[PDB]
Amino acid sequence: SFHVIWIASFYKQNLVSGWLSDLQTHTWDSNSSTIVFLWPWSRGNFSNEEWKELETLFRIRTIRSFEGIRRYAHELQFEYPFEIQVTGGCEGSFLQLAYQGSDFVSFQNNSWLPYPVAGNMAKHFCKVLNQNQHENDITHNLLSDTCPRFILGLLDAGKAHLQRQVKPEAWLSHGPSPGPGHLQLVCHVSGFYPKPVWVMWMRGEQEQQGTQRGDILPSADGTWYLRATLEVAAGEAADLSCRVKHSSLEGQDIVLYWEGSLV
């Protein structure tokens, strides 16, 4: 899936960026008002001249959208400060808008529809958003025609980067908040790509089901990080190991052992 997000904060700050899921591929420069390509392959198979076309509606619609929101704020009952977020793309296509961090309106086929729970405010917003049917037809074609064609070229162009395999490294430490009489064993796993990973504390071949995996967290170099912790009684921390499995290791698990100066 590819999508574009828009973050607009009113008190007048504006951010537009494009994404392959977690991976940022495009940014919008306000000062130049240009589309910045974050990777060589971010251009996909879109000709250099076809890229200035896309920039045009991005030109006009980004600042017509930003401008449009503030004149209507009164009748729409938007009260300062507030934030609008938009996400749109394809996988199937979608375009959704939030007001103050909650679902507000969305684009379905050919028109903007209000979320029922969002109330009459969202209804009044849709009226404005739907006042020109042609502008809605352009939105439709961007999502069901332009976005699907783009994402194919993007994935092909980036295939090398996207299917690369980067091996994890791991290490053990003491965790900060064990209960009385207990230890917290921490197994850190870092530098892996792509995201799916397996990590467990073990006693020999027995997985320790007390193993608590944290969130998978990003690194600036585009790889991932994870902490897995185990609470154990201090008497029972012998013979424990942390075992890491990842696509990139081709069956050769990383295995680290709780001991040495750790005990």
Which residues form the interface with ligand 3XU (CB under 6 A)? 4, 6, 16-18, 26-28, 35, 54, 61-62, 64-65, 68-69, 86, 88-89, 95, 97, 128-129, 131-132, 135, 139, 142-143, 146-147, 150
CA distance 167 to 208: 24
Which of 81, 235, 251, 260 lies at the binding interface for another protein (CB under 8 A)?
A: 81
Give the DSSP letter of residue 146. I
169 binds another protein (CB under 8 A): yes
Q: Up-side HSE of residue 159: CA atoms within 13 Å toward CB?
A: 5
131 binds, among ligand 3XU, another protein, none (CB under 5 to 8 A by kind): ligand 3XU
Q: Whole-number minimum distance, CB 143 to ligand 3XU, in Å? A: 5
Q: Up-side HSE of residue 102: CA atoms within 13 Å toward CB?
A: 10
In order of 29, 103, 114, the CA distances from 99 in angstroms are 24, 7, 12
225 binds, among ligand 3XU, another protein, none (CB under 5 to 8 A by kind): another protein
* 3-state class (DSSP) for residue 166: strand
Identity at 112, one-letter amino acid code: W
* 3-state class (DSSP) for residue 210: coil
Which of 219, 234, 236, 239 lies at the binding interface for another protein (CB under 8 A)?
A: 219
Give the DSSP letter of residue 179. P
168 binds, among another protein, ligand 3XU, none (CB under 5 to 8 A by kind): none
* 3-state class (DSSP) for residue 39: coil
Q: Which stretch binds another protein (CB under 8 A): 7-15, 54-62, 126-134, 145-153?
A: 7-15
H or E stretch at 110: none
Identity at 107, one-letter amino acid code: F
Binding site for another protein (CB under 8 A): 5, 7, 9, 15, 17, 19, 24, 27, 81, 83, 85, 87, 98, 100-103, 169, 171, 173-176, 186, 188, 190-191, 214-215, 217-221, 225, 227, 262
